[PDB]
Design a protein around this ligand. Structure first.
Ligand SMILES: O=C(O)[C@@H](O)[C@@H](O)[C@H](O)[C@H](O)CO
Ligand SMILES: O=C(O)[C@@H](O)[C@@H](O)[C@H](O)[C@H](O)CO
Ligand SMILES: [Mg+2]
Ligand SMILES: [Mg+2]
Lengths: 384, 385
């Protein structure tokens, strides 16, 4: 058996999405997500100009060998661009293998460990009053868990957002106090610090959030230096989550082994496919750390398909982030998974259950779009 | 003052090179290297399609701000492609800054700490005898330091596949160095590149066997994604350790340095985010007496070498600089102010990093796909080349 083509397909039905389709001399084919929000074309070139030509002629059934080949062979290892390409390949290969085996992907990983996949919604508001109402809305819809984010009163090319930590420190804890007073403690409440705090400030925020029993406080402080979470972990029992921007297990080995986090957010597209995410989930499992896969809209339905198959099997499953795609996106990427009363469900279609309608995809041309950047009040470049 | 253009130039005068040229509304312009061997076009896209557009209109004098902007603004941080793009931008801006100051770059970093820059050459051979001969040649050319690599007897359009067997290497390599010292004595720095082929225990074993031959260093003995991998090596041998040519940020070497597991950090100006970031890596290293030993193979353009030599000229904890000669064509395409003489490199007094690019001449050498090799164990196992 041989790979006869590895094509990259770009479409923009609501936002940019890059897909890889691996074709074989047998007919069966597979697709993988390679979308890197804000730097999409870098992965396209990585795949088309470099990886693709090497895949031709290889035996697609050798998922592990090809993963190692693309990972080690690159010589310059790890990285956002590099791992996205590897993930796209890995996803396409597992898709092919599941199809050939005639089973939905989760069966190959080890079968299902659960039925539905708990997810959390995005309750946003310009202020507390508005955010509180938004959480009520997600509660009405059947969500067992809701992430609450609020604007802080007083706070194409990349947009520029402002930030001031002291204002956030004084406001955010009031949001959650109001949420608990209003809705009680029967719901999982989450918060994304979005890399804005130093370890000490994160420790301060976490301790102030303790009486509100949050499901987790995410990406509280930049994690390039994994020891950064030590101070936070030492000063608070608020659950900690991190990892959406991670691309390999090395970005989290110390956070996990030193028990500095409760949820690992790495995704199938961000951390090199099922092959590598599995290793990350395994290490986490040893320390009772659970999966809490990132799932914003900049991850295509292909990723969500693969993520749900993963979530259906993984023992130490924690939760799955869920952001709805547009109708156009859903048309370009027909899939076998659906939402129902706060839970996602993966179908029984062989492969990861997702496909790409190339003809329809061609009707939505690439359109550049950047993620925002943040600056402090004095103009200092900060973390968005 | 504003950036009016940030163009990417591709040329292949002997091998592929990617260059970024930042222009301003003041006449002065700067260039930086963005070459990532075997994956060149991904950096071209990263820069061309995403970063360049954002640079238009920014104040080129704000080197730190722009570095932080591209580094943090990317959201998805670190990585070989990401850092190569950032390094190119940084090099071009420091180049512009030094030109505007009317001084060669090293003056801005803090002035020269030395005259010449010691380099080491590449003595290779298919077997010990041939390799011993090559070392003698390099010694004849006046090299004070020589890296000696030998093929082991029992062991470009697309990735070539090379074979590997650790046991055979372990039995053969120590004999190379034993022969070298017996033939040339100990009045020469001798270096060896393990090139990621060994596990930590095997590297400890190799290092220990090499101890009698006093090596200047044993480089990249074992994969370092897990910085703890050098702990076993360091605890079992006194042979000096070097690592880092494939690193792209200070976070790839933080623990290696602070836990004193290495003696030389090999990170480069193009691999680790430019002068701005490499300086931070050098500063951390000096606190533990770790010295610089910047990688410098041919896949790094003269723009990188120029920047590296300015950095080497200033940095106090300088150790050594790798030097692989570029082809005449490459030297013609990239006019530069630095030269070699009796085992040392010297950077010139030309304002900026002293390097430039002849765009008209560069256009005469079309890009040509070329990959690095891959290695597989005897049983077919994908390994580290
Ligand atoms: O946790 C989250 O949902 C956010 O961090 C993401 O929306 C993130 O900002 C985007 O995925 C970046 O592309
Ligand atoms: O230390 C060295 O000289 C080698 O490791 C390099 O030639 C390396 O193989 C290449 O620079 C990779 O592009
Ligand atoms: Mg987040
Ligand atoms: Mg090397």
């Amino acid at each position: 058996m041989k790979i006869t083509a590895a094509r990259v397909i770009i479409t923009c039905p609501g936002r940019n999405f890059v897909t890889l389709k691996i074709e074989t001399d047998q007919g069966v084919y597979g697709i993988g997500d390679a979308t890197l929000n804000g730097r999409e074309l870098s992965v396209v070139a990585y795949l088309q100009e470099h990886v693709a030509p090497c895949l031709i002629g290889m035996d697609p059934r050798r998922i592990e060998d090809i993963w190692q080949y693309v990972y080690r062979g690159a010589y310059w290892r790890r990285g956002p661009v590099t791992m996205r390409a590897i993930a796209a390949v890995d996803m396409a290969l597992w898709d092919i293998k599941a199809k050939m085996a005639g089973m939905p992907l989760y069966q190959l990983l080890g079968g299902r460990s659960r039925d539905g996949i708990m997810v959390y919604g995005h309750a946003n508001g310009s202020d507390i009053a508005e955010t509180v109402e938004a959480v009520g809305h997600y509660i009405d819809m059947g969500y067992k868990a809701i992430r609450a984010q609020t604007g802080v009163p007083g706070i194409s090319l990349p947009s520029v957002t402002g930030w001031d930590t002291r204002k956030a420190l004084n406001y955010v804890p009031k949001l959650f106090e109001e949420l608990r007073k209003t809705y009680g403690f029967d719901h999982h409440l989450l918060h994304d610090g979005h890399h804005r705090y130093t370890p000490q400030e994160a420790a301060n925020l976490g301790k102030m959030l303790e009486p509100y029993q949050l499901f987790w406080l995410e990406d509280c402080t930049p994690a390039e230096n994994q020891e950064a979470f030590r101070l936070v972990r030492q000063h608070t029992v608020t659950p900690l989550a991190v990892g959406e921007i991670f691309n390999t297990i090395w970005d989290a080995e110390d956070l996990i082994q030193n028990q500095l986090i409760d949820y690992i957010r790495a995704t199938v597209v961000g951390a090199g496919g099922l092959t590598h995410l599995r290793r990350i989930a395994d290490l986490a499992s040893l320390y009772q750390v659970r999966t809490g896969c990132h799932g914003a809209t900049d991850l295509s339905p292909v990723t969500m398909g693969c993520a749900l198959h993963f979530d259906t099997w993984v023992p130490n499953f924690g939760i799955q982030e869920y952001m709805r795609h547009t109708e156009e996106t859903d048309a370009v990427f027909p899939h076998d998974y659906w939402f129902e009363k706060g839970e996602l469900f993966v179908g029984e279609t062989p492969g990861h259950g997702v496909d790409i309608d190339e003809e329809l995809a061609a009707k939505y041309p690439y359109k550049p779009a950047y993620l925002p950047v943040a600056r402090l009040e004095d103009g200092t470049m900060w973390n968005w």
